[PDB]
Amino acid sequence: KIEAVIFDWAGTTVDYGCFAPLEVFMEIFHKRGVAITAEEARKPMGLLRIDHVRALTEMPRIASEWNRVFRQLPTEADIQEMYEEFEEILFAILPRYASPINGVKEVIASLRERGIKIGSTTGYTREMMDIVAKEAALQGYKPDFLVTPDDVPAGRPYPWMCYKNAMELGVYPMNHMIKVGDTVSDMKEGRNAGMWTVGVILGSSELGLTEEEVENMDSVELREKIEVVRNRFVENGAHFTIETMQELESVMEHIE
Amino acid sequence: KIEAVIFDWAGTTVDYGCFAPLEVFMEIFHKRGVAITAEEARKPMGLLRIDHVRALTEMPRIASEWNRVFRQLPTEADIQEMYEEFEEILFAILPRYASPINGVKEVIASLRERGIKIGSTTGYTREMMDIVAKEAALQGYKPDFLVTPDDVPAGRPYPWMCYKNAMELGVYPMNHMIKVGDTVSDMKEGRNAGMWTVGVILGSSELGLTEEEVENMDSVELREKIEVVRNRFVENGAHFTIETMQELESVMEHIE
Ligand SMILES: [Mg+2]
Ligand SMILES: [Mg+2]
């Protein structure tokens, strides 16, 4: 009754916590008078990447730091010089954030045993994905199919990439597929394609914690922070939420 | 609440009764010792076209006729020689069966006035369609989009061509679209894509009558034959049925 499950990438099967991007931002400011925390790097949710770099420029404290190092406030020339460098570094460190999130390759092991096809979508461009897919593959993870915002007319809020997975995998009543993701947009994409949509919490971007940070942290503070992310997913489309991929099989059963 | 309507071609907007194919079959046997009625030409529902030609060969009466003309029963060589000719003639006469079914261009006139996008699918190949689309266009009918079994991994029972119309037209909750067709397979395709599916009766293939034959015929015999086709559509997926395109607007309203 459920022939396919389509997974998201970073924050769902690869790059726990989703740090690759934050790493580049921190790097770029570091090469000069950095002083930037990964907490500041997650705030920027502007439209374009350049807008992100600009946002950090604007951020008081960071601005002040730049001034104490250069005796001047950041310039358009400066913003332009840094952004220009973002993509170079990104390609350089992606291989380091392409390892299965653990529990993953094991459920993908199953599911595939009981005849379920596995597809996927992403916000990453085709280029980026060639690199990521190869490292991830050469490490225990490789989906039956893959689609990017380049292979269709639009980005992710839209269902175009999901319909592609459908055709290529040969599964059709859309409600015979499940969408799993780590962010609010993942929920929307799924609801827009008429699929059962499930959101994962531990390891998501919505959570923001590191594999290591979660390890520690006050057990009562975690269960509070998890409860917040779960509420956001639901309020945005999720049909079901789960803490680790290891509850997926169970959810399927429920659906039937 | 309903942004798009996607129409079928032959039997829905073009070629009333859907005769182009029957014409070729009749032609091919005519060139020799024909004696074939358009009623016999509609029976063959085999897998391949060659299988259709073979079926007529097999048909007693037709077989007998061939024997009285050639003193021999049809040959593999013969079946092969005729089929080989089918596609040539088909291209030759398609222009003659590409005129709007009347009432059509007028509802397409409307609908489009109230902002509804019009897409379409077909069983016809890309080639055939270049010819048909041009004649139909140059006569009052031209949809916003067009898709064929060539532009996707599979034929019509599947929803692949419908999803294509969706992406290109930019309409997404599938249940915001209506599927209109003239056959049982049209109903299936629609139900498989999660759309509201409506079947038209007067002018369909399921009915089998000619614009002229319907004109005449015993008014009480028609209403009986219509009732039969309507029952077949429903038993196969139709959400609503209509006698002429001129009831479509009304059905939309009902849906809302
Ligand atoms: Mg993600
Ligand atoms: Mg038809």
Structural domains of chain B in order of their starting residue, each with its CATH number: 1-19+98-256 (3.40.50.1000), 20-97 (1.10.150.240)
Q: Are B146 and B129 in contact (CB under 8 A)?
A: yes
Q: Are A24 and A86 in contact (CB under 8 A)?
A: yes
Q: Which residues contact B90 (CB under 8 A, 6 or more apart)?
A: B20, B21, B24, B128
Residues A232 and B62: their CA atoms lie apart, in Å, by 71
Nearest residue in A to B159, CA atom: A172
CB-CB under 8 Å, B167 with A173: no
Distance from the Cα of residue A165 to its chain's centroid: 18
CB-CB: which of B153, B168, B194 is closest to A194?
B194
Q: How many helices (H) and strands (E) would you count in chain B?
A: 11, 5
CB-CB: which of B154, B163, B192 is closest to A173?
B192
Residues A172 and A3: their CA atoms lie apart, in Å, by 9
Residues B206 and B201: their CA atoms lie apart, in Å, by 8
Residues B188 and B88: their CA atoms lie apart, in Å, by 31
B160 contact residues in A (CB cutoff 8 A): 166-167
Q: What is the DSSP letter of B24?
A: H
Give all strands of the β-sheet with B117-120 in edge-to-edge order: B117-120, B4-7, B177-181, B196-200, B240-242
Tell whether A3 lies on the interface with B, counting CB pairs under 8 A: no
As given in the structure block, the two tokens for residue B197 are 């599916």
Our CA dihedral for B98, B101, B102, B106, rounded to 10 degrees, sits at -80
- One-letter amino acid identity for A160? W
List, as ranges, residues 124-163 from B with C-beta within 8 Å of A.
Answer: 152-154, 158-160, 163
Residues A116 and A3: their CA atoms lie apart, in Å, by 5
List, as ranges, residues 216-245 from B with C-beta within 8 Å of A.
Answer: none
CA angle B1, B4, B10 (to 5 degrees): 145
**Cα–Cα distances in angstroms (integers) from residue A157 to residues A15, A250, B144, in the given order:** 21, 27, 24
Q: Are B208 and B17 in contact (CB under 8 A)?
A: yes
Residues B202 and B184: their CA atoms lie apart, in Å, by 14
C-alpha closest to that of A116 among A195, A192, A171: A171
Tell whether B192 lies on the interface with A, counting CB pairs under 8 A: yes
Beta pairing class for A177-181 and A196-200:
parallel
Residues B246 and B106: their CA atoms lie apart, in Å, by 9
Residues A118 and A245: their CA atoms lie apart, in Å, by 14
Distance from the Cα of residue B233 to its chain's centroid: 14
Our CA dihedral for B27, B28, B32, B36, rounded to 10 degrees, sits at -60
**Quick one: B135 exposed, middle or buried, by C-beta within 10 A (0-12, 13-18, 19+)?**
middle
Q: Are B177 and B171 in contact (CB under 8 A)?
A: yes
Interval between CA A177 and ligand 1 midpoint (Å): 19
Exposure string of B150-172, with b = 16+ CB inside 10 Å and e = fewer, is eebeeebebbbbbbbbbbbbebb
Q: Are B36 and B28 in contact (CB under 8 A)?
A: no
A155 contact residues in B (CB cutoff 8 A): none
Residues A46 and A115: their CA atoms lie apart, in Å, by 41
Residues A12 and A132: their CA atoms lie apart, in Å, by 14
Distance from the Cα of residue B8 to its chain's centroid: 7
Task: At A15, give phi and psi (nearest 5°).
Answer: 55, 75
A163 contact residues in B (CB cutoff 8 A): 163, 166-167
Interval between CA A122 and ligand 1 midpoint (Å): 8
Q: How many CA atoms lie within 13 A of B18 on its CB side?
A: 24
> In DSSP terms, which residues pair with A14 in a beta bridge?
A10, A100
Residues B25 and B80: their CA atoms lie apart, in Å, by 14
Residues B191 and B193: their CA atoms lie apart, in Å, by 6
Q: What is the DSSP letter of B182?
A: S
Task: At B13, give phi and psi (nearest 5°).
Answer: -130, -20
Nearest residue in B to A166, CA atom: B160
Q: Which secondary-structure segment (H or E) carries B134?
A: helix B126-137
Residues A75 and A77: their CA atoms lie apart, in Å, by 5
Interval between CA B104 and ligand 2 midpoint (Å): 15
Exposure string of B80-110, with b = 16+ CB inside 10 Å and e = fewer, is eebbeebeeebeeebeebbbbbeebbebbee
Resolution in A: 2.9
Q: Are B80 and B18 in contact (CB under 8 A)?
A: no
Tell whether A192 lies on the interface with B, counting CB pairs under 8 A: yes
Distance from CA of B33 to the nearest CA of A (A): 46
Q: Which residues contact B87 (CB under 8 A, 6 or more apart)?
A: none
Other CB atoms within a 10 A radius of the CB of residue B196 amount to: 22
Our CA dihedral for A155, A156, A158, A160, rounded to 10 degrees, sits at 70
As given in the structure block, the two tokens for residue B45 are 């529902």
- One-letter amino acid identity for A89? I
- One-letter amino acid identity for A161? M
